[PDB]
Amino acid sequence: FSEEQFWEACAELQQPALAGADWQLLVETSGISIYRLLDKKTGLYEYKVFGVLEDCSPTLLADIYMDSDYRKQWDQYVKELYEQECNGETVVYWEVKYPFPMSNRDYVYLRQRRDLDMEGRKIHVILARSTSMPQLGERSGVIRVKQYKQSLAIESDGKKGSKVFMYYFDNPGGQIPSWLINWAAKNGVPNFLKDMARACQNY
Ligand SMILES: CCCCC/C=C\C/C=C\CCCCCCCC(=O)O[C@H](COC(=O)CCCCCCCCCCCCCCC)COP(=O)([O-])OCC[N+](C)(C)C
Numbered sequence: 001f002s003e004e005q006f007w008e009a010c011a012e013l014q015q016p017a018l019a020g021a022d023w024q025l026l027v028e029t030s031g032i033s034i035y036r037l038l039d040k041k042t043g044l045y046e047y048k049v050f051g052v053l054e055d056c057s058p059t060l061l062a063d064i065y066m067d068s069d070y071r072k073q074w075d076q077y078v079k080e081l082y083e084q085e086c087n088g089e090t091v092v093y094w095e096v097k098y099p100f101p102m103s104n105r106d107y108v109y110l111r112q113r114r115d116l117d118m119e120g121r122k123i124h125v126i127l128a129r130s131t132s133m134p135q136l137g138e139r140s141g142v143i144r145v146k147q148y149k150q151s152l153a154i155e156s157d158g159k160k161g162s163k164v165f166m167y168y169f170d171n172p173g174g175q176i177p178s179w180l181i182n183w184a185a186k187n188g189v190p191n192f193l194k195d196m197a198r199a200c201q202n203y
Contacts (some may be wrong), residue, residue: 001112001127009125009151029190044203047168050167055159056200058154061162062124074199079104103143109135124154147171
């Protein structure tokens with residue numbers, strides 16, 4: 001992760017560049033919308049998120065976003081999660097709860113946050129990249145996602161909450177049934193965002 005990337009993540013934050021290709025809404029909640037672009041060759045998706053979360057100190061959100069011990073503690077979909085220093089960087093292992101029959105999914109990745117000063121504005125930006133480790137090979141039963149990358153941009157909304165932009169993409173190593181998307185969309189996330197807000201006020 002370079003200087004470059006971090007600032008890049010801040011862009012669509014200011015301005016939602018969706019014109020480009022065939023993006024599509026999918027959800028709107030707590031003041032948040034989720035777009036997605038489908039690579040027709042692979043059938044994979046690209047998600048993009050914008051929105052505002054009043055009641056979430058831009059500063060809190062960011063801290064809460066890196067606090068595993070706590071995140072592990074309140075995020076109903078976290079099966080396993082822990083960090084380790086490998087060389088000079090922080091590598092994260094994360095296991096995600098998938099409805100049985102489906103195998104959970106686990107990620108090994110390089111995470112990095114940087115608080116930016118752009119125009120006298122604190123713009124909390126975090127980056128995520130999939131990486132690998134001899135000592136941390138794949139697991140049986142759990143699907144190791146080897147392609148994954150996300151970036152989240154936090155910022156004050158001026159009032160009580162925080163305006164945010166997020167880019168996501170990973171290859172789940174399996175087909176995601178559309179009902180799952182429907183649940184994710186129609187119930188999954190809404191609740192998550194709900195549980196997370198509760199998670200802020202209680203920090
Ligand atoms: C500044 C705002 C902070 C974020 C809040 C706003 C939006 C986050 C929620 C949704 C973003 C959509 C793209 C991420 C999906 C990956 C799952 C995840 O991992 O979902 C969580 C939030 O759990 C949830 O929704 C609960 C849903 C879990 C069900 C699992 C199967 C989902 C199948 C596809 C979902 C279909 C799209 C949803 C329709 C809206 C965001 O993971 P994370 O970014 O906290 O770190 C993530 C680090 N891994 C990648 C290593 C985990």
